[PDB]
Amino acid sequence: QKRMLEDGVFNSEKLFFEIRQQGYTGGKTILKDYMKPFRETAKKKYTVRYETLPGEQMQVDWKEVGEVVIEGKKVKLSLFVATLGYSRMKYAVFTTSQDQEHLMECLIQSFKYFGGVPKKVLFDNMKTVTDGREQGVVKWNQRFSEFASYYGFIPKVCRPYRAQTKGKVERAIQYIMDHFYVGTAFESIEELNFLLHRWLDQVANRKPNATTGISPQERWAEESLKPLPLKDYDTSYLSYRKVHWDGSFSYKGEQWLLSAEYAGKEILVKERLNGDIRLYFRGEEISHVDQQKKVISFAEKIKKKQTEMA
Amino acid sequence: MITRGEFFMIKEMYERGMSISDIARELGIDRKTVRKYIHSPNPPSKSKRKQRKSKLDPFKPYL
DNA sequence: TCATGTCAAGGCCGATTATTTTTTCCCCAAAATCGCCGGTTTAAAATTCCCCAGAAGG
């Protein structure tokens, strides 16, 4: 028994031979029997699947699933599905891509829809979430770790890294969603996600499972969703930019003109996923750059500043 | 290409007396791969490849 | 309305494409190990059968 507890050796013939060397007067075969219930309980443990407790994990998963030409520009549609374990409810949304900021936005949306947070969140291996896993030393990130601590949950990405017991269910739910929804709202992916949310509220979260026979919404209601902090960890890209001695800097191919005090110093641009840029310098907030949909050349910006100073 | 830690774990658990097949199951590795690594000197996690041809090779002397 | 600095290149990072290597999965065949059941052997426990003493009844 201690041999199995410590060394996990469920080999019956070997243990019988060992104890025979130790002075055993019994028979190999009854020890084979005895070690069977042991290894059979071990195989029961091996087959142990779906150990989801109420409010334990929301089964996060990402995948590129679509392609659209939004505004005449090709873009790859990326879908996020968080399945709430025990309840079996799932929040699904496909918006832009697999960037970390959109990941956090989707997690916040799922928490708001579920009205709370679970104990932990289980992800899938990818570029985001974790930069790199080295022999169990999983260094996820700094900002992501702060976000997880802020909301309360913790990353526990340890799914099976094979097509068995992870890929099977993932593709199952993926194509189940694809076939049942198969919606096409409009060229704009935002409207597509709007109709997706309607479909999820109508015939996805209220679709009883054949085995349980109860809509997952009831289990979700009875699950433990601890209240979320009621505020959202910032979902804006943070990026530093140096200002040339011209009082100018650059961001995503557009060049901005600052004032004299800001020339030659490092500002921090914060861009919400909404699409508004805010310039924070030395902790404080500086004047907005009146961002416009139409791109204006640096020459026009210089002319505008000249006229303004006039 | 099991990493240093993976090879250390395989060798240690095998020498402890644990069966090899369930070792492979636990570490998510093929049984043949694990058995081959049982009788191996040190963790293999490096592959050496030499340079290869590029597009700017013919122009390189001129540049 | 004066006067008033501006543009290009290099480096780095990210994403995509192409090539090579490694690992896994599925199917079939052979060998080894493990598990279960049955039989045999050994040890311990239970029941029944004959003669001596004590007690009760006519």
Curated annotation (Swiss-Prot), chain B:
Residues 20-39 bind DNA. Transmembrane segments: none annotated. Residues 5-63 form the HTH IS21-type domain. Residues 35-55 are annotated as: Disordered. Belongs to the transposase IS21/IS408/IS1162 family. Involved in the transposition of the insertion sequence. This is Putative transposase for insertion sequence element IS5376. It comes from Geobacillus stearothermophilus. The chain holds residues 1 to 63 of 400 of the full protein.
